[PDB]
Amino acid sequence: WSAEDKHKEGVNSHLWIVNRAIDIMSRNTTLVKQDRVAQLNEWRTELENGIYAANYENPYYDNSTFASHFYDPDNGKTYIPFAKQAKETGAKYFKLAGESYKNKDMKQAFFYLGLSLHYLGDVNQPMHAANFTNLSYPQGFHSKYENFVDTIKDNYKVTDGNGYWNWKGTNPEEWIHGAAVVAKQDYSGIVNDNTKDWFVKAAVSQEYADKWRAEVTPMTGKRLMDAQRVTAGYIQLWFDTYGDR
């Protein structure tokens, strides 16, 4: 997903997903210790820096190839042979974040958590779970899709306190993989002959621009809602793991 501005949700779907996940945690009054939400907000600057940095600097964006932002659950690979994938990478920062947290280095801890959350967010994007890049046919569709998502994301906010608590085991890798499995299933609802066809014809006919945009909205809403719930659960897992217990 997009991460155009470090501190603005308008053009940062990643930040939006995390903020909506935090809201889910705040709405939950039966399981979540609100002191956890207070900590996230206390180091929000470092958290947002991490969410943003993943798409703009090494080693996070893999020399501008973004290889680590992809993960196909069926073969466990990214789109470039032998490159690092989102599962091992997101898990790496989940653990680095916890170690810093236990050593009381809050700035380092939340920066790394932000990075981990970025990768978790990406596998919720069907294209990232199917190795469909901005160079895949139709080329350019990937970036335009993510650009469009920013214009409608606010219509799919989760308004209850039900995150996927303890969704998968205690291994962060399981959550990333699990999210990817669900995302890849919803792939066809976004990339198919119709949307491909219309996206191509959209170059000359605005009428077709509206057609593919409307076509991918339903599945997009479902993916964004799931991403919020899974992210809330992931954050809860992090605190339960490194919050001393």
Binding residues for Zn ion, per CB under 5 A?
1, 55, 69, 122
Q: Which residue's CB is nearer to Zn ion, number 39 or number 55?
A: 55
Residues 51 and 115 sit within 8 Å (Cβ to Cβ):
yes
CB of 157 to Zn ion, least distance (A): 18
CB of 218 to Zn ion, least distance (A): 20
CB of 203 to Zn ion, least distance (A): 20
Name the phi and psi angles at 130, rounded to 5: -125, 10
Instruction: Tell me how crowded residue 11 is: count the other CB atoms within 10 A of its CB.
Output: 14
Q: Which residue's CB is nearer to Zn ion, number 1 or number 238?
A: 1
| Residue 10 CB partners (closer than 8 Å, separation 6+) | 150
Q: Which residue's CB is nearer to Zn ion, number 122 or number 186?
A: 122
Query: Helices 44-53 and 106-122: crossing angle, nearest 10°?
Result: 40
Q: Which residue's CB is nearer to Zn ion, number 72 or number 122?
A: 122
> Residues 128, 147, 196, 133: is their CA dihedral positive or negative?
negative
Q: Which residue's CB is nearer to Zn ion, number 221 or number 243?
A: 221
CB of 86 to Zn ion, least distance (A): 8
CB of 122 to Zn ion, least distance (A): 4
Residue that has been written with the tokens 């077709």 in this structure: 208
Instruction: Tell me how crowded residue 148 is: count the other CB atoms within 10 A of its CB.
Output: 17
